[PDB]
Amino acid sequence: ANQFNSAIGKIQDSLSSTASALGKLQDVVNHNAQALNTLVKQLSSKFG
Amino acid sequence: KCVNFNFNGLKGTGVLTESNKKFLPFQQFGRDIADTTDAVRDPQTLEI
């Protein structure tokens, strides 16, 4: 009970500081952020 | 009101609303992120 209760609090201190552990979910958003900004920039192209 | 536009030869369809920003006095029109006209100066009197 000393080892387990300190181990959950190291997860809470890591996620409050380091933001790159959740960055696999941030690559879900940023691939969709380039995909919705793809079709906006194609409207300014003259296409010949 | 949604109406048809002819503004100095340039055509479109939209709703005319009042601009709150600071614009150039020599500006005929201006473009959005998709390079279409979202704002245009009135020809007879000075209003955008």
Swiss-Prot record, chain A:
Functionally, this protein is described as follows:
Subunit of the fusion protein that is processed upon entry into the host cell. Mediates fusion of the virion and cellular membranes by functioning as a class I viral fusion protein. Contains a viral fusion peptide that is unmasked after S2 cleavage. This cleavage can occur at the cell membrane by host TMPRSS2 or during endocytosis by host CSTL. In either case, this triggers an extensive and irreversible conformational change that leads to fusion of the viral envelope with the cellular cytoplasmic membrane, releasing viral genomic RNA into the host cell cytoplasm.
Protein origin, superkingdom: Viruses
Indicate what this protein is called per its UniProt record: Spike protein S2'
* Residue span of region Heptad repeat 1: 1-47
Q: Which residues of the full protein are shown?
A: 924 to 971 of 1273
From Swiss-Prot, chain B:
Indicate the impact reported for residue 34 to D: In strain: Alpha/B.1.1.7
Q: Cite the record's note on assembly.
A: Binds to host ACE2. RBD also interacts with the N-linked glycan on 'Asn-90' of ACE2. Cleavage of S generates a polybasic C-terminal sequence on S1 that binds to host Neuropilin-1 (NRP1) and Neuropilin-2 (NRP2) receptors. Interacts with host integrin alpha-5/beta-1 (ITGA5:ITGB1) and with ACE2 in complex with integrin alpha-5/beta-1 (ITGA5:ITGB1). May interact via cytoplasmic c-terminus with M protein. May interact (via N-terminus) with host bilirubin and biliverdin, thereby preventing antibody binding to the SARS-CoV-2 spike NTD via an allosteric mechanism.
Say what the protein does: Attaches the virion to the cell membrane by interacting with host receptor, initiating the infection. The major receptor is host ACE2. When S2/S2' has been cleaved, binding to the receptor triggers direct fusion at the cell membrane. When S2/S2' has not been cleaved, binding to the receptor results in internalization of the virus by endocytosis using host TFRC and GRM2 and leading to fusion of the virion membrane with the host endosomal membrane. Alternatively, may use NRP1/NRP2 and integrin as entry receptors.
Name it: Spike protein S1
The full protein's residues present here are 537 to 584 of 1273
